[PDB]
Each structure stands twice: as C-alpha cells, then as structure tokens.
DNA sequence: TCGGATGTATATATCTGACACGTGCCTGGAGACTAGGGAGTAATCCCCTTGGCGGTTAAAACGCGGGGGACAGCGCGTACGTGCGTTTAAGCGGTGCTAGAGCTGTCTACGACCAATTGAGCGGCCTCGGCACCGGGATTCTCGA
DNA sequence: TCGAGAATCCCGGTGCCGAGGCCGCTCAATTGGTCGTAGACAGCTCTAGCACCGCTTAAACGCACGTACGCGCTGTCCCCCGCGTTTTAACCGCCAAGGGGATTACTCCCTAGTCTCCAGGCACGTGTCAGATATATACATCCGA
C-alpha cells in the first residue's frame, strides 16, 4: 500500500473554476504546471509543522488543532475549527 | 446552430461562482495527495477528516488571493491573458521569495 | 538496428488482418478478411505462395517448432493443425464463435492451448481431440489471458483484475500468484502478457497505459504471494496514447509499441527503455497490427490491408569503399612521422 | 430597430432533522479575614537639550539645447474559447474491526527554596598604531574620426 | 577600425584619536541541604479510522472550429538630461543657560491565600417549524437581420 502519484489528480477544469472565482477572463495554457508547483510548495511547510507538533505530542493521528497552530505560525489564521 | 460569442459564458461563470460558496476540488484526490506528501516525513499516520477539510480551505483561499493579484498585474501590463511571468512577478513582490 | 525512415511497403494483398513470422523470422503468413494462406520472401520483397483457405477473417496463426506446421482460427471455430507443404485440415469442432488465441507448446506441437473470448483457456492435445480446461478462480471476469513461457515450463494466467495465477503445463501448479496496483486506486485490466526471445525478461501491458517490465526468475524466487516490483515502467509522457500492440526486439533488447490512435509509433529499449525515436506516419491511418523481425529491423505494420515497412539505421559512409580515406570529424593537425624520411601451407577449404 | 431564443427569478407545496427549550446537579465562583510587600510620593542635581552668532562654501537653483524614449496606428496567424459526444471514477449506501486515544491509580525522583562566600565581570585610565587624509603620478574607458 | 582626453586607480607621506589592555573592586552565583508534588508509568475500555463492496451518473475528456489579439513595425515629437552660472543656507565651532530625569528614603493599603458555602452552567433529553427541495411560469437578455 504505497502511494506515489495524484499530484496530477488536480484536474485542469478545477483550476479553471478557481480562476473564475478569482475573477479571471482569459487563461493561457502554460499556467497549470506552474500552479501545481506553487500549490505543492505551499503544502509542504504546513505538513512539516503539523507533523512536528504531532511527534512532540507522542501520538500517531493528526488532529485539526495541530493544523490550526501550524497555520497560526504562518501568519494565516483560520477561524471555525476550535 | 446557435452559438454565443466568446467570453459571455465566461462572464456568467464569473458571476455565479462569485455568488456561490462551496468547495471546488473533489475530496478523494486531494486526500490522496495529502497522504502522499505526508508519507515522506513519517510513515503510518492517521488523519481526522476535519484536518483534511481545514487544509483544503486554507489552500483554496490562498490560491484565490494569488489569482486576484495576478489579474491586477496582467491588467497593468495592458493584456487580458495571464502569463507565468506575471505569477512570478506577484510572488516576487509579495516577498515570499 | 533501430529502424528510422520510410523504406516503402509491400501492399500487394489487401484486407490484411494478422501477420506472423516463422521460427527464424524469415517467412510470413497473413490471414485476411477472406483468410488466405499468403506467403512471402523478404530479400526479394516478393510473394512466395498464395493459398485460399476459407471465407472468414482468420485471427490466430502460429508456426511450428521446426517452422513447418501451422494452425488457424477463423470465426467458425475452425482449429486444425495446418502445414506448409499442403496445409490441410485435421481437427474442427465447437468453440464459442469469438476465438482469441491458440498456442503451441514451445517444445511440443502436440500440446496446444486454445483461448476463447469469454471462456476459460483450454489446453488441447494434437494427437487427438482431447482438451484440458485450466481452472479459473474468479468466473466473473471470464477474461483470463494465458500463455506458455518461452521454454515450455509454466502457463501465466492473468485475469481482468490484475491477478496473476501461474499454472504448470501439465499439473496446474500454482508456484506463483500476485496482483498489482499503481498510484493505488484499484487494480487494472490486464491488456496482454508478453515474452522475449533471449531469457525471461518480459512485460505486462495494462489498461492504465503503463507497461511494466518483469522477470520470471525473481517471480520464482518470491514464489507464491510476493511483491514483485517492475523492472521498468513504460508509458507516454505528454499524452495518454492508448496502446493496441507491443513487442520486443528479436532478442528482447528493444521494445517497440504500437499506439491505437495516431499511426505515429514509439520505440524503447529494455535496459534503458528510452524513447529513442517516434516513428511518425499519416494521421488518417488506423494502425491495426505490428510485427518485428529477429535479425533485421523490419516493422510489419498492417493498417487496413496496407502493410508498410520502416527498416533503417544503416547509414553508408566511406573507408569501406575507399579504405585509404580516413574521415576526420574536425580538423586533425599532426605529423605522422617523427622522421618524415612464411611458407605455411594454409588450407583454402578449411570448412 | 425589431424579433425569436433563451437562462433566470418568481410563486407554491411537503418534509425534516437542526434548533430551541425543560432538567438535575455539581464544581467553581462569592464572602470574610489576614499580612507584607509593590508601589506612591517628596527632595535633588546635574546633565543634556535648546538657543544663539559669524564664516564659508558646496550645493541648490535656474536656463538651454537637443536627441533618444513614449507612444499611437496597422497587420497578421496564432492560440484558445464554445459545443458536442463519449468514458470512468467520485460518491453514496452498508459492514467489520481494531489499534489507539482516553481516563484512572500510585508513587517517587526532581525542581523550588535558604544561608554563604568568593571570583568574575564591570567602571575607569593610557596609548599607540590602523586608518583618515592629501599629494602625485600611472591607467583606462569613451567618443568623435 | 583609430587618437584625445577626462575620470579613475595605485603609491607614498603624515598624524591621531579610539580599540585594547590593565587595574580595582561589589554582588551574585555556586554548595549543600530539605521537601512537597508533576508526572511517569501501568491498566482497562470503546469508538472512530480504516478496509471492502456494489451501484450509479455526474463529471471529465477529446476534438473540431472559428475568431480576435499580442506582438511586431514604423513614424512621430517633446521633455528630460548634461552643462554653465549664479545665490544661500548648511555646516562648524562656540557660547550660555536651565528644565527634567534618574535618583533615594519612606509609609501603606491592596492583592495573594484560606476556608466555607451554594447556585449558574452544563450534559442530556425532548419536540417542531425554517428551510431545503420539487414544480410551473412570467420575463430579461442577447445575437442577427
């Protein structure tokens, strides 16, 4: 049971709908792998910090509070989860 | 044989997607992506579903803000179409890199 | 070596369905829409022999261990042993009317394995009309592609659910069985099972448009219920490119695969397995069959009767015509000199 | 300018399962009492901020000419939307099960705390040389031929 | 492709004030001791996270196709730059004067801490209507002649 993919699992039309909510009229073609790279570079840091909290707490599952504190260190604070 | 001119359907898409509030990415591929890049720092982890939802919310909000600033850049360069150099310029000026 | 350019064709016979080279690669039989026994010569690029056989598209064809006996499979379950001298029928009885594969044992032209469309693979003797049905675990797929190995030891029976089941050619011994998933969502419909000519490095085509290279030695090392990793994963990078047919080289060194979409074909190796060349073609052509020659880079490409051939990597140069000519690459300045100025009775018929 | 073809609010009928509301009960907040120590408050002094006066010059201000950047119209053929038809895997139910989170009980090794010295780091005082500074001559990039 | 020439870039002599070092000393950090408890650890439970399975259909995907625009080109024109000439106030050194900020000594009253007590908040168990959802239907708008 080893996963090795689904970074491509983010489809093309989903990024289109995110651009439409963003207020975008006309998109090039070269944007998509750029956007996937930006997304993965974003996620890596938060995952490192949540793993660090969980490892210090001596547990095996990841709660929501750990994600909240990891976001809180970044300056991007989230409301609505405790 | 009825066909619209290009852009009109895009504008009404913009209207209804700014009207609605929900998630825009299917949950299982995002979940498998999270487990994939979580595998490397430590093996055999478990996840409350709420944490996955929180990650999805934060990432989607971040991307929307990035697209807004990119669109401002592309309007300033007197175009309509968005380029990856505009994305690079926005991430340069914001100070993330 | 790796064939490159146009080379023309031999489109002498239309409605071509399948094509098969003999044991030495040197003959060719093409059953057509009518299903005739049409034979060629290769150095002449000429037709050797045409024999009318039936009216139906004869799907499955195979040569013999000497390269002198044959087998046929039309739409009407006609499964006889055939010959290259007269080519006459021996056996014919009922099967389900879509028939996929018949297959001689590679050390005995008595044992033959008949694979129908939605039935279990059935192993027949050719001494008589005996038939031996191999066991199926699922009985819900009804699509278990089976094949003898190159030697004649085992039968590799794999379902449409990615499950491998190895059977021995006479006693059905499950010496190995496993299942494969990648980028793990679920299993994959097995497209085909392949075998090389030198050794046991082989591969599996799967419906994820990904081709995974294996080796039966490590399979027997793990035996039953191991986790055999692929030697090499082959796929298309830019696009999907769904596959119709794949094949090795004449020893299993190059691996060239035929797409089912574009008539523009892709070449790999075994060890590296790099996409070394895209052999292009006309976009308005439907690729239907691919064959490869052992000691010659022949690409027999049936595209609706059109059998076109690309055969190169031989580029002529000098020093064989004029061995005095020493072809430098760039400017070679030098001075060749550091000072610029017995009765052996040798056999001539030693064979 | 008119005319049809639309996606779009608009009116109404029905279920339902989150939201609002009673209920027992307890653990945490209120009421009195006590010290003792943090902080308020009155001198006080001397230092460091403000204020002013001439000199001088280096820098700011003001014209002038011009030629190189901003910019607006044209022209193309390229890349990307729109619509349709064809696959597939997300999604929605049902079941199992079990590692693992969570609460309980017991003790004990480990940090809070109180004299006591002592040496270690901090204020004060020379000094002498690395760098400031000036003259002077070799070098070298630019710009009209 | 060239010489003239105007900034630069080593080289060498002068001198000088600020690191660096030395010294003298108060205060705080260490030693040695007790002691009350945070947490380390063992044990039991039960509940969500995972795994598997079957069915469906919404959703993705490929493919022409036709068009509109991003970029290039070319001409324009004017305004910002390089230079010379003249004013002026920034600066530096210097002088005086006085308010305010550290500064210590001295009460004192305000909050930690204790104990007793008792009810507002909380888990739990209800019902029931606000909104979701389905259905017809005026109508607002957009592309084409």
Q: Is the CB of A59 under 7 A from strand E?
A: no
Structure token pair of residue C226: 């191991």
Give yes or no for A1 touching B (CB within 8 A): no
**Nearest nucleic acid nucleotide to B26, CA to C1' distance:** D90
Task: State the helix-helix crossing angle for A64-74 and A31-57, rounded to 10 degrees.
Answer: 120
Distances (CA, A) of C121 to B8, C93, C131, C162, C195: 58, 16, 10, 17, 18
Q: Which residues contact C350 (CB under 8 A, 6 or more apart)?
A: none
Cα(C16)–Cα(C274) distance, rounded to whole angstroms? 31
Distance of CA C1 to the CA centre of its chain: 17
CB C37 within 8 A of CB C47: no
| Angle at alpha carbon of residue C19, lines to C13 and C21, rounded to 5° | 120
Determine whether the interchain pair C184/A2 forms a contact, defined as Cβ–Cβ distance below 8 Å: yes
Q: How far is C218 from chain A (nearest CA, A)?
A: 20
Determine whether the interchain pair B46/A51 forms a contact, defined as Cβ–Cβ distance below 8 Å: no
- Please report where in the chains the tokens 């020093």 appear, as a residue: C319
Q: How far is A2 from chain C (nearest CA, A)?
A: 7
Nearest to A9 among B32, B81, B91 (CB): B32
**Nearest nucleic acid nucleotide to B25, CA to C1' distance:** D90
Task: With CA atoms as reference, report the closest residue to C169 among C111, C121, C99, C231.
Answer: C111
CATH at B60? 1.10.20.10
Structure token pair of residue C70: 């044959």
DSSP strand pairing (C306-308 vs C299-303): antiparallel
- HSE at residue C225, side-chain half, CA atoms within 13 A, is 0
Q: Is the CB of B4 under 7 A from strand E?
A: yes
**Which residue range(s) make up the domain with A69?**
1-81
CB C245 within 8 A of CB C193: no
Say how many domains are in chain B.
Answer: 1
Give the containing element (helix H, strand E) for A65: helix A64-74
How big is the A-C interface in CB pairs under 8 Å? 9
Report DSSP state, residue A59.
-
Cα(C325)–Cα(C327) distance, rounded to whole angstroms? 6
- Three-class secondary structure of residue C267 per DSSP: strand
> Within 10 Å of residue C120's Cβ, how many Cβ atoms?
17
Give the containing element (helix H, strand E) for A22: helix A12-22
Cα(B33)–Cα(C144) distance, rounded to whole angstroms? 33
Q: Which residues contact C31 (CB under 8 A, 6 or more apart)?
A: C17, C18, C37, C53, C57, C58, C59, C61, C72
Give the containing element (helix H, strand E) for C165: strand C164-168
CA of B7 to C1' of E70 (A): 18
Q: Is the CB of A11 under 7 A from strand E?
A: yes
CB C41 within 8 A of CB C29: no
Task: With CA atoms as reference, report the closest residue to C21 among C59, C57, C61, C56.
Answer: C61
Structure token pair of residue C169: 């050619």
Structure token pair of residue A62: 């990841």
Question: Partners for B (CB, 8 Å, 3+ pairs)?
Answer: A
- Three-class secondary structure of residue A76 per DSSP: coil
Q: What is the full DSSP assignment across C195-232?
A: --SSSSEEEEEETTTEEEEEEHHHHHHH-SS-----SE
CATH class of the structural domain C9-310: mainly beta
**Which residue range(s) make up the domain with B86?**
1-97
> Within 10 Å of residue B54's Cβ, how many Cβ atoms?
23
Q: What is the full DSSP assignment across chain B?
A: ---PPTTHHHHHHHHHHHH--S--S-HHHHHHHHHHHHTTTSSS-EE-HHHHHHHHHHHHHHHHHHHHHHHHHHHHTT-SEE-HHHHHHHHHHHT--
Cα(C222)–Cα(C41) distance, rounded to whole angstroms? 45
Report DSSP state, residue C179.
B
Q: How far is C271 from chain A (nearest CA, A)?
A: 23
Task: With CA atoms as reference, report the closest residue to C96 among C72, C117, C125, C123.
Answer: C117
Query: Which 44-73 residues of chain A touch chain B by CB within 8 A?
Result: 44, 46-48, 50-51, 54-55, 60-64, 66-68, 71
Determine whether the interchain pair C183/A2 forms a contact, defined as Cβ–Cβ distance below 8 Å: no
**Nearest nucleic acid nucleotide to B32, CA to C1' distance:** D90
Structure token pair of residue C156: 């590799």
Report DSSP state, residue A69.
H
Give yes or no for A31 touching B (CB within 8 A): yes
Cα(C223)–Cα(B59) distance, rounded to whole angstroms? 46
Structure token pair of residue B48: 């409350």
**Nearest nucleic acid nucleotide to C186, CA to C1' distance:** D89
DSSP strand pairing (C81-83 vs B46-47): unpaired
Cβ contacts (< 8 Å) between A64 and chain B: which residues?
Answer: 48, 50-51, 54
Cβ contacts (< 8 Å) between A2 and chain C: which residues?
Answer: 184
Query: CA of A17: which chain B residue's CA is closest?
Result: B24
Helix and strand numbers (H, E) in chain C are 1, 23
Q: Which strand E bases fall within 7 angstroms of a protein CB?
A: 48-51, 60-63, 66-71, 142-144
- Radius of gyration of chain C, Cα coordinates, nearest whole angstrom: 24
Q: How far is B2 from chain A (nearest CA, A)?
A: 22
Cβ contacts (< 8 Å) between A62 and chain B: which residues?
Answer: 45-48, 51
CATH at A10? 1.10.20.10
Give the containing element (helix H, strand E) for C221: helix C216-222
Determine whether the interchain pair C183/A3 forms a contact, defined as Cβ–Cβ distance below 8 Å: yes
Determine whether the interchain pair A6/C182 forms a contact, defined as Cβ–Cβ distance below 8 Å: no
Structure token pair of residue A12: 């093309």
Give yes or no for C304 touching A (CB within 8 A): no
CB C99 within 8 A of CB C114: yes
Distances (CA, A) of C227 to A7, C39, C172: 25, 45, 22
């Amino acid at each position: 049971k080893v996963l090795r993919d689904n970074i491509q699992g983010i489809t093309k039309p989903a990024i289109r709908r995110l651009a439409r909510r963003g207020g975008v009229k006309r998109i090039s073609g070269l944007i998509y792998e750029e956007t996937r790279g930006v997304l993965k570079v974003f996620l890596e840091n938060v995952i490192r910090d949540a793993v660090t909290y969980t490892e210090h707490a001596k547990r095996k599952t990841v709660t929501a509070m750990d994600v909240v504190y990891a976001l809180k260190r970044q300056g991007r604070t989230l409301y609505g989860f405790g | 044989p009825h066909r619209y001119r290009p852009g009109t359907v895009a504008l009404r898409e913009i209207r209804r997607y700014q009207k609605s509030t929900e998630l825009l990415i299917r949950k299982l591929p995002f979940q498998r992506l999270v487990r994939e890049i979580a595998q490397d720092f430590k093996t055999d982890l478990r996840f409350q579903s709420s944490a996955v939802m929180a990650l999805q919310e934060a990432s989607e909000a971040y991307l929307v803000a990035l697209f807004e600033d990119t669109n401002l850049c592309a309007i300033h360069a007197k175009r309509v179409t968005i380029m990856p150099k505009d994305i690079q310029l926005a991430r340069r000026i914001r100070g993330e890199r | 070596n790796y064939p490159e350019e146009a080379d023309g064709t031999l489109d002498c016979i239309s409605m071509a369905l399948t094509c098969t080279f003999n044991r030495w690669g040197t003959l060719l039989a093409v059953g057509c829409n009518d299903g005739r026994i049409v034979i060629w010569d290769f150095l002449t690029r000429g037709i050797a022999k045409i024999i009318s056989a039936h009216i139906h598209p004869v799907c499955s064809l195979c040569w013999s261990r000497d390269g002198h006996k044959l087998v046929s499979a039309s739409t009407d379950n006609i499964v006889s042993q055939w010959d290259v001298l007269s080519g006459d029928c021996d056996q014919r009885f009922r099967f389900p009317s879509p028939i996929l594969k018949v297959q001689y044992h590679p050390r005995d032209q008595n044992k033959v394995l008949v694979c129908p469309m939605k039935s279990a693979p059935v192993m027949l003797t050719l001494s008589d009309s005996k038939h031996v049905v191999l066991p199926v675990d699922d009985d819900s797929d009804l699509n278990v592609v089976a094949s003898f190995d190159r030697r004649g030891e085992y039968i590799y029976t794999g379902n449409a659910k990615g499950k491998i089941l190895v059977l021995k050619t006479d006693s059905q011994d499950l010496v190995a069985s496993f299942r494969v998933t990648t980028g793990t969502s679920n299993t994959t419909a097995i497209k085909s099972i392949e075998f090389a000519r030198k050794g046991s490095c082989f591969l599996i085509n799967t419906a994820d448009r990904i081709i995974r290279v294996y080796d039966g030695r490590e399979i027997l090392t793990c035996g039953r219920d191991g986790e055999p990793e692929p030697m090499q994963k082959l796929q298309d990078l830019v696009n999907r490119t769904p596959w119709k047919k794949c094949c090795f080289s004449g020893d299993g060194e190059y691996i060239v695969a035929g797409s089912a979409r574009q008539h523009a074909l892709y070449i790999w190796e075994k060890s590296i397995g790099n996409l070394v060349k895209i052999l292009h073609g006309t976009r308005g052509e439907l690729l239907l069959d691919v064959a490869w020659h052992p000691v010659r880079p022949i690409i027999a490409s049936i595209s609706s009767g059109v059998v076109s051939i690309w055969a190169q990597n031989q580029v002529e140069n000098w020093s064989a015509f004029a061995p005095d000519f020493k072809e430098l690459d760039e400017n070679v300045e030098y001075e060749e000199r550091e000072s610029e100025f017995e009765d052996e009775e040798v056999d001539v018929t030693s064979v």
